[PDB]
Amino acid sequence: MLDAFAKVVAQADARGEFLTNAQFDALSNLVKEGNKRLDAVNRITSNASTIVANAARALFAEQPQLIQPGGNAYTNRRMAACLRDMEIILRYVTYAILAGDSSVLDDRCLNGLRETYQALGTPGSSVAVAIQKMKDAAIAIANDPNGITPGDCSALMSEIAGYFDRAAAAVA
Amino acid sequence: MLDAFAKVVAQADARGEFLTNAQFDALSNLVKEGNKRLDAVNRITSNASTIVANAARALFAEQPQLIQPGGNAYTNRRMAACLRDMEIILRYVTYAILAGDSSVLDDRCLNGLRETYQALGTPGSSVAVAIQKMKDAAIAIANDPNGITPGDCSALMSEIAGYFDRAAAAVA
Amino acid sequence: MLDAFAKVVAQADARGEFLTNAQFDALSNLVKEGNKRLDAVNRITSNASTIVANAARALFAEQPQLIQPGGNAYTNRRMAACLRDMEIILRYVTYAILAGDSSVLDDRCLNGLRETYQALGTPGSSVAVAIQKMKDAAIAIANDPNGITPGDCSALMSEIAGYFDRAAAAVA
Amino acid sequence: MKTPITEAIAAADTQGRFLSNTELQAVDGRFKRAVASMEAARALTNNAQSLIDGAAQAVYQKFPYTTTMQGSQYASTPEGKAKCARDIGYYLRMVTYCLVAGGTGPMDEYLIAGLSEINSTFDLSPSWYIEALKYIKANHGLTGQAAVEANAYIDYAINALS
Amino acid sequence: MKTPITEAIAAADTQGRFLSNTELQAVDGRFKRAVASMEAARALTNNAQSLIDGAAQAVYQKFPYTTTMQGSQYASTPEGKAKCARDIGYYLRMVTYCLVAGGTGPMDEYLIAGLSEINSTFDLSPSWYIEALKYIKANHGLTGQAAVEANAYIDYAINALS
Amino acid sequence: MKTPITEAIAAADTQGRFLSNTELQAVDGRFKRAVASMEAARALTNNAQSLIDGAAQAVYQKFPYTTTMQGSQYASTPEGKAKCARDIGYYLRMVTYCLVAGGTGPMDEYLIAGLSEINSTFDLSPSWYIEALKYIKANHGLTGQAAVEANAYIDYAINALS
């Protein structure tokens, strides 16, 4: 597992070099935007149960075949397993937001997941729909302009978007 | 593991249905022939050691190369292993007779066995000869007309035959 | 694991035979040269640390890219792992000298090692260079004419050579 | 799936044994009890629609707030009433399956695993479903050992909701 | 296969070590004892046919019932006599293998694993085979440390049958 | 790699949890301390060449025998002096990496695992490297909390060599 700082260090060691000034300045830039990164993780975390629930209700209304007898989310054991999977993806995405790097997400979550769904009979394209719905909910909560000191968080919302998409691409 | 009843239930749940009258009547039919199913399992079980021994002596007389030095049943460790394999197949077959379904046999015995014999150098066609000999012995013992209340057990002997053949087909 | 005696026994049992006189005489020959086999294992063993060290220093002088940043033996953890690998090969080779058969070496060391180096990114041809250097050092120490009762050990040095080469062929 | 016949095999196989007399006695007990279990499963299946329709109205009369409050968890809209009637039928249908197999296996696998997670996540109260099951028990119209069989499985579900 | 040389390697490898002096002493002991072991293996091999023929007759005189009762387990038929003579030769041949290797390994792998299962399954008595081994011990005609080597392995087999 | 941010994730993930306030406080502490750590890393990087050149001469004055004895482990030849100066630079470079990441991770992975094996195998003395690190500590020219950051990592390396 790396973070954005350790990333830069492991690259410089590969060629046996001290850091350039450009690199110190880019890492100083990271540290200065850190408050906003912290607001985003707290907001998304404090509403975790509602993000998952509403995305689930949405998917089953659009794709009602998933819950008909014979469906991949029919019976309470398969429904519970589906709900669990959503909670987990959302967790490893919040980890990667803190770290500022996708390595915790790729290495401990997405790696091998496509093959798992194909072996179980779970439709991967359906999962990717669920991820995309959690994304749009999360960005709205994090970038809500109320009850916070005003400023610009757009570069951060663009980075966040990236992590959700990456999870989506990996299952489909 | 399923039995003949659980089988019917898991099929009806797949399409979200209550049972039809045809199905209640077929399952009532099962319950009425249950005594004979019980006689057959007791008779075959009470003579297990003799069924295995006589089938072994028969195979080695017909295929004497199996016990020549270099053979797959030469030395007491390989002979013991061969005798063991026969005892096991006979056991999982008696289980499936009780249950009225082949799932315990397929899932916990036959599944992966062909590949095992090919990796060890054991001749699978020879094993299938041994199974067929245990079969003819078992059906004779179960359908012996003496010391029992007379009746017709032919449909049951046909079902029993099926399980032995299935084991045979899987190794060869 | 076999030794040279057990080898002959397992072959004779395969065809169900007592030993011929030719075989008793060849095994009597083995027992008569046993002192020299014992001198060779003690000498090579008593200088194990120097054989490994000097071969390592030699390889890194010839192939200095291995220890440049980014190299397969750069950092103290990878260097330590490299040194360890050499110590191990040298150990299983001394075992096979005692036994007079290569089965302990093939079965517990060389088997699967090529595939391991390919998966890690370790250059196998470089390892084989290191093995060959330990060989030439070991034969010189074992066949040193001083401080020992004179005689001829050439057939034994030829057998020893064989084991080092076999290890070399397997990684490259 | 747990039935009196799969339990018997499981005990022999666990210890490496052939079946013995100890196990055969169990399976005969099952075969003898089946006459009563089938009587009950057929009756419940034939009268299923009026049992479901009466059970839903019993819930609505006991907790009137579920037909008036706003929320997707309630029966205040036509879709919500549709979904409540479907759940009650799921529960009835699992009772008939238990009776046919001679034990709890089907209700264990298809319904009770995951139950408390689903109820918490979608804001559904256990007390609602208990009321419905009590209505079916009181009005299935069965007598004797067939009523005994039906009640043992209905009470099994009530305990899991408590 | 268990020999004095494979045991020595096994102890070094188990603990991750190079061989030491502790282990080299063992292997020299083996090399020194070999002069007596080979003397015995050659003698037993050269006189094998009369030892097998005399051992079978000793069994038939001690348990006369094995040449008269009906059954495929007995020596009451020509095929049964053929099979008994073959087993006795298996036992002799495993003794010579032990002597050549310097330990019990061959008799462990080729004969003693599975022995009590095979005897029970085909209705063969241990006492029959013990009698034959006693005959070979009493008549191999060996003296000194070579007789000592032969007897230690014959007695090993008798104990496994007891 | 061990940093204050990877430790925080590791504790949540180990117990199956989402991040909480307990963990967010840690990462803010890290972000606040970074102003001092960067001041130190830049200063050490800018003056690296005179620090390495002065550190090597301090070693040679304390243990004069390393510039005269024969052996590939010593600095008695031009190649040996070249190699000693390179090792000292490795050590300095790992201190700057620790400061940038906010913890010991880099020095743990790239240098301290394997250290005592390498020193024993090539006949290199710990005391030599400790002397060099003491020279850098005494002459980096830093003051205040930036000198505090630099010294905590230099002392970390000295302890591993003791």
Ligand SMILES: *[C@@H](C)[C@H]1/C(=C/c2[nH]c(/C=C3N=C(/C=C4\NC(=O)C(CC)=C4C)C(C)=C\3CCC(=O)O)c(CCC(=O)O)c2C)NC(=O)[C@@H]1C
């Ligand atoms: C973009 C996400 C939205 C936004 C963010 C924003 N926040 C600040 C300032 C602060 N954020 C914090 C938050 C924390 N510090 C912690 O240690 C923790 C966890 C323990 C949290 C959650 C703090 C303390 C500040 C400074 C104090 C304050 O209230 O101002 C800013 C200001 C700029 C900065 O980086 O300091 C901004 C812009 N504001 C928006 O309008 C977006 C919708």
Ligand SMILES: *[C@@H](C)[C@H]1/C(=C/c2[nH]c(/C=C3N=C(/C=C4\NC(=O)C(CC)=C4C)C(C)=C\3CCC(=O)O)c(CCC(=O)O)c2C)NC(=O)[C@@H]1C
């Ligand atoms: C076909 C296999 C042979 C045959 C069978 C046969 N059996 C019966 C009747 C009975 N069988 C039993 C046996 C058991 N009940 C148990 O609970 C157990 C284990 C604990 C056993 C072994 C019993 C009790 C009966 C009824 C009493 C009786 O002795 O009659 C029948 C009769 C028809 C029926 O299904 O009841 C038959 C036909 N008979 C043959 O001729 C075949 C060779």
Ligand SMILES: *[C@@H](C)[C@H]1/C(=C/c2[nH]c(/C=C3N=C(/C=C4\NC(=O)C(CC)=C4C)C(C)=C\3CCC(=O)O)c(CCC(=O)O)c2C)NC(=O)[C@@H]1C
């Ligand atoms: C070839 C490798 C070199 C060589 C060998 C050589 N050795 C001997 C004789 C002996 N070697 C030993 C050694 C041991 N016996 C043990 O039990 C152990 C370990 C516990 C060891 C190391 C002994 C005892 C002897 C006999 C006594 C003696 O010192 O002579 C010979 C002589 C021939 C023989 O096989 O006996 C030879 C030739 N000699 C060389 O010149 C080669 C360079």
Ligand SMILES: *[C@H](C)[C@H]1/C(=C/c2[nH]c(/C=C3N=C(/C=C4\NC(=O)C(CC)=C4C)C(C)=C\3CCC(=O)O)c(CCC(=O)O)c2C)NC(=O)[C@@H]1C
């Ligand atoms: C819900 C949106 C969809 C759905 C999901 C579904 N998944 C499973 C089973 C599994 N999911 C995983 C995934 C993970 N396990 C991990 O540890 C991690 C990373 C930490 C991940 C990402 C695994 C391993 C399984 C198999 C094991 C298990 O189920 O416990 C199921 C179960 C299917 C079944 O039981 O047969 C389901 C239903 N189903 C849908 O219809 C949605 C599209």
Ligand SMILES: *[C@H](C)[C@H]1/C(=C/c2[nH]c(/C=C3N=C(/C=C4\NC(=O)C(CC)=C4C)C(C)=C\3CCC(=O)O)c(CCC(=O)O)c2C)NC(=O)[C@@H]1C
């Ligand atoms: C006898 C008719 C034939 C014969 C048999 C033979 N089999 C083996 C080895 C194995 N048999 C199995 C099979 C199973 N193990 C299980 O657990 C189950 C289901 C519960 C089955 C069906 C396995 C796994 C093995 C390998 C492991 C073992 O041997 O314990 C051997 C041994 C061969 C050897 O030791 O090299 C033999 C001899 N050989 C014949 O010639 C007959 C045709």
Ligand SMILES: *[C@H](C)[C@H]1/C(=C/c2[nH]c(/C=C3N=C(/C=C4\NC(=O)C(CC)=C4C)C(C)=C\3CCC(=O)O)c(CCC(=O)O)c2C)NC(=O)[C@@H]1C
């Ligand atoms: C040194 C001459 C070369 C070199 C070596 C190198 N090897 C590894 C890693 C491994 N080596 C092994 C080998 C074995 N393990 C065993 O148990 C046995 C038999 C008993 C053998 C033969 C294994 C399994 C590994 C992987 C596990 C481990 O490293 O502990 C490394 C490590 C590489 C890394 O950490 O990424 C290295 C460096 N490298 C060179 O450049 C030389 C050519």
Ligand SMILES: *[C@H](C)[C@H]1/C(=C/c2[nH]c(/C=C3N=C(/C=C4\NC(=O)C(CC)=C4C)C(C)=C\3CCC(=O)O)c(CCC(=O)O)c2C)NC(=O)[C@@H]1C
């Ligand atoms: C009826 C007594 C009360 C009630 C009903 C109600 N239920 C839901 C939603 C769900 N019901 C289930 C139940 C099951 N699914 C299964 O697969 C099984 C086992 C076969 C059972 C028992 C589930 C999983 C859900 C959630 C998913 C889905 O919609 O299918 C709703 C809708 C809630 C929502 O938020 O959409 C309602 C209204 N509510 C009342 O007010 C009645 C008194």
Ligand SMILES: *[C@H](C)[C@H]1/C(=C/c2[nH]c(/C=C3N=C(/C=C4\NC(=O)C(CC)=C4C)C(C)=C\3CCC(=O)O)c(CCC(=O)O)c2C)NC(=O)[C@@H]1C
């Ligand atoms: C002789 C003292 C008495 C006796 C002999 C007898 N033995 C058998 C059958 C078998 N003998 C063995 C023995 C071995 N097989 C091996 O691979 C090894 C190790 C190398 C041994 C020791 C076995 C396995 C059998 C059964 C299989 C086979 O026939 O080969 C028989 C035949 C018994 C039968 O039922 O066919 C007999 C007669 N019986 C006497 O009466 C003698 C006094």
Ligand SMILES: *[C@H](C)[C@H]1/C(=C/c2[nH]c(/C=C3N=C(/C=C4\NC(=O)C(CC)=C4C)C(C)=C\3CCC(=O)O)c(CCC(=O)O)c2C)NC(=O)[C@@H]1C
């Ligand atoms: C300098 C204070 C004294 C000294 C230096 C000296 N060192 C070596 C050889 C080695 N140095 C290392 C160190 C590292 N390699 C790494 O990858 C890392 C982490 C990034 C470190 C710290 C190693 C592994 C070696 C051995 C392999 C190599 O040559 O690279 C030498 C050469 C010793 C030899 O026998 O070749 C010397 C001379 N010696 C002194 O006298 C100085 C006072």
